Amino acid sequence: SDEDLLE
Amino acid sequence: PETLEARINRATNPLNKELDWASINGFCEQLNEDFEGPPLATRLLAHKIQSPQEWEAIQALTVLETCMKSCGKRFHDEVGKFRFLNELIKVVSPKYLGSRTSEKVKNKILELLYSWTVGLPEEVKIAEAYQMLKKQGIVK
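ok -> structure tokens follow
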């Protein structure tokens, strides 16, 4: 239900 | 009506001599009308925005900007997910696509994200994505 924040 | 694809393809055609507001504003109208409008719109936008063809990418950002102003909570929420924001981060960041994207495109994106952290404070993930770019010294 969402990706992780891309560092 | 015309599909989101048909809309976005006209609205971002690299053949356009000028901005095509029929197509741009029709895109926004259409994603707002359709149940699964907003998630599709966001998928189609990300791809266009990552185009190596600058005028396609710049037009796509203009669409993004336009619909963020006119639509949304459904649209605002789709754009305020990392699923979408990551695609922007890819564009502006040296680690990823940043090195082969123009300053114009990357500065436009950075501008847009800022404008959102202010106009849409409830979309806390946009602010997360912005502060992360700032902490890395991408902003700006």
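Chain A touches chain B through six residues (CB under 8 Å).
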